[PDB]
Design a protein around this ligand. Sequence first.
Ligand SMILES: COCC(=O)Nc1cccc(NC(C)=O)c1
Length: 130
Amino acid sequence: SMQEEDTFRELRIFLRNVTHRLAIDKRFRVFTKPVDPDEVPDYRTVIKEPMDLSSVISKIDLHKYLTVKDYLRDIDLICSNALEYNPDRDPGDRLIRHRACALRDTAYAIIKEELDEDFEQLCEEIQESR
Ligand SMILES: COCC(=O)Nc1cccc(NC(C)=O)c1
């Protein structure tokens, strides 16, 4: 229905706003663009599904997310990839893991305060019907 298409458009507007607020935070600059395969040739041999905030914007615009649950799977993937690729005790690895956990926690906190639970339940019921 037109009403259902209006629901998914409101979801996309919400998701672009949350993603922009993450992408402008100085702590999360390392997560804003894909890892450059020229500068880090071993990245794609270790990390099987790369993800970053510019790719998340592209996916919103391609209508890849029909629920906030869908979207948070990709935020969780940015975080898990950082913990996997950078597991050591040295300061550079510990700084990127701290920033990855902050990105995940910040996304979940914005959604807790600003996503209506009945809006999410409506998106999940339309997705299930298709
Ligand atoms: C300056 O080197 C270019 C570069 O991007 N290196 C580099 C090294 C290790 C990790 C990461 N990024 C993530 C998201 O894990 C990036």
